[PDB]
C-alpha cells in the first residue's frame, strides 16, 4: 500500500492496558520525563545539593519526618524522630537546631 501515519503528541501518561484500542498516544513506558502540555516530553528537572544532614542511621523505615512552614517563606523546619529518642530539628540550610 505504501502508507504513513502519525502518533501525535505523547502527553497522556503510561498505560498498562493492552495496545488493542488503548488510547491515541500513551507512551507505554516513561522514566524521568517532565511531561507537560506545551513542552511535550522533556527530562525531569535536576536536583541541587544544599547541605548534608548526617550518617546513614538518621532515616529508617519507621522514622517520622515532619515538615512545617512559618512566616513569609523564611522559616522551614524538618523534624526527624528515630525510634526510642527525642526528635531532631533541622533548618532550611541544614544547620542543626539545639533542642532542650
Amino acid at each position: 500500500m505504501e502508507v504513513q501515519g502519525s502518533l501525535g503528541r505523547q502527553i497522556q501518561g503510561i498505560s498498562q492496558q493492552p495496545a488493542s484500542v488503548r488510547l491515541p498516544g500513551q507512551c507505554t513506558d516513561a522514566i524521568n520525563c517532565s511531561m507537560d502540555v506545551v513542552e511535550g516530553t522533556k527530562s525531569r528537572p535536576g536536583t541541587v545539593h544544599i547541605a548534608r544532614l548526617g550518617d546513614l542511621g538518621l532515616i529508617q523505615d519507621n522514622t517520622n519526618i515532619h515538615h512545617y512552614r512559618r512566616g513569609d517563606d523564611v522559616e522551614e523546619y524538618w523534624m526527624i524522630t528515630n525510634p526510642l529518642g527525642i526528635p531532631d530539628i533541622f533548618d532550611k540550610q541544614g544547620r542543626k537546631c539545639t533542642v532542650t
Partner: protein, 100 residues
Amino acid sequence: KWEFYGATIGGLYYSGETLYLIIKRNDGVFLEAMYMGDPLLSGSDQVRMDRTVTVSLTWDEATLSWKSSPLPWVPTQVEMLEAVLTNGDPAYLGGAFLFE
C-alpha cells in the same frame, strides 16, 4: 516514574517555589532541592543533572592542566557523572568537557 541509583527517599516536601528532597545516598543523607519550575538562571540551555555543586577551576602550570576545588560528596558511580562549564570562554560557554 523517576529513578535514582542506590537512593532511599525519606519523603517529598513540596514547599512553595521549591521541592525539598531528603535522600539516603551511599556516603550519607543529604537534603536536595529541585527547581522543578526549570528557571534558566544562566547559559543557553538548562542543566539536567542529579545533585549540583558549583566548583571553581584554576590553571596549574605544574602539569599544564586545570584543577578544581575538592568535591564535597562521594559520587555513587565515577563513570556516570560529567562536568558542565558555566563561566569561561564565550565560545565554550554552557558545554560539557572531558576530565580526569
